[PDB]
Write a protein that binds this ligand. Structure first.
Ligand SMILES: N[C@H]1[C@H](O)[C@H](O)C[C@@H]1C1CCCCC1
Length: 330
């Protein structure tokens, strides 16, 4: 089997991407944030504290003839940005772009933090990291991909995020028309439950490539590119007036600036992030200070190849017995 679904930026900045997902019978379609950095499929629901729902589409398990309460199961997750959610668990039928999984754990939110409430465009998350990170207790549950894998033509999914444009998540096949040149594959460590890999280095604009190992995770659920302070300083040094602002919470730059590209290495291959991908707009409405798309990972504990990096590439998440990651230009 295969699946193919369009993923769409939630706003003009590509802050996140949502993908339609069919849950239950008859289908209830929710727009989920596909997150290769987490492993829970959770949704706004009929059970979510009413005051914490503001415009989201909700899953109503009582209206699904295939919904079954997973007795005694609870979940609770907190993400890297300080947001959180929790609730109970159903199993139900879940389909993404024509690919169907029966008995998928659908985690129903009873509580969500303010940042989820305040974002009307995201109805929940669909985790695509390794199932070892799943927070369901006392019986850990598998991700959608983990459940689908054996049925897929090939045990892979691909992320093809657009810049200011829709893109595609494919399951079970590699669309050879969706990228240029070749796909370069690179080793993955699953030790921390992430799609963790090691970049071979970087360049800033037309500058010389610096060969240096950068361990990080491929995370579709993170907006920005988070890299070591040395690398990030080298980047913003090429932008007149750019500086790190403690009050804003990262590097900012004059909105009048022309940003240089950023290149990262995948083995001997190179992925080039165009400068305008790195512009995340005025720090507040009307401001002439803009927020940078490359930020320091220093206070995180891990480097994160988020959407800013990933949307410059066609990315293969290879879920073979020994998982690997593939990157191609496009
Ligand atoms: N909505 C945020 C995304 O998640 C990125 O982290 C940056 C963006 C925003 C830009 C304006 C300054 C504050 C941060």
């Amino acid at each position: 089997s295969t699946g193919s679904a369009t993923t769409t930026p939630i706003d003009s900045l590509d802050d996140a991407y949502i993908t339609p997902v069919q849950i239950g019978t008859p289908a209830q379609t929710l727009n989920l944030d596909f997150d290769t950095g987490s492993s829970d499929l959770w949704v706004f629901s009929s059970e979510t504290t009413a005051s914490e729902v503001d415009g989201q589409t909700i899953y109503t398990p009582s209206k699904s003839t295939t919904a079954k309460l997973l007795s005694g199961a609870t979940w609770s997750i907190s993400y890297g940005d300080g947001s959180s959610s929790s609730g109970d668990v159903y199993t139900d039928t879940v389909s993404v772009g024509g690919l169907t999984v029966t008995g998928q754990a659908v985690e129903s939110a009873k509580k969500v933090s303010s940042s989820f409430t305040e974002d009307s465009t995201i109805d929940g998350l669909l985790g695509l990291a390794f199932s070892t990170l799943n927070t369901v207790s006392p019986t850990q549950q598998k991700t959608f991909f983990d459940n689908a894998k054996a049925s897929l033509d090939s045990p892979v999914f691909t992320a093809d995020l657009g810049y200011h444009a829709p893109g595609t998540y494919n399951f079970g096949f590699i669309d050879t028309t969706a990228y240029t040149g070749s796909i370069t594959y690179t080793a993955v460590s699953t030790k921390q439950g992430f799609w963790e890999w090691t970049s071979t280095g970087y360049a800033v604009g037309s500058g010389t490539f610096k060969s240096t190992s950068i361990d990080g995770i491929a995370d579709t659920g993170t907006t920005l590119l988070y890299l070591p302070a040395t690398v990030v300083s080298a980047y913003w040094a090429q932008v007149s007036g750019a500086k790190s602002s403690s009050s804003v919470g990262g590097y900012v730059f004059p909105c009048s600036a022309t940003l240089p590209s950023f290149t990262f290495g995948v083995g001997s291959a190179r992925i080039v992030i165009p400068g305008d991908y790195i512009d995340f707009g005025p720090i507040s409405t009307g401001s002439s200070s803009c927020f940078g798309g490359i930020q320091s990972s220093a206070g995180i504990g891990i480097n994160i190849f988020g959407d800013v990096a990933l949307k410059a590439a066609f990315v293969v998440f290879n879920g073979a017995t020994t998982p690997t990651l593939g990157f191609a230009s496009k």
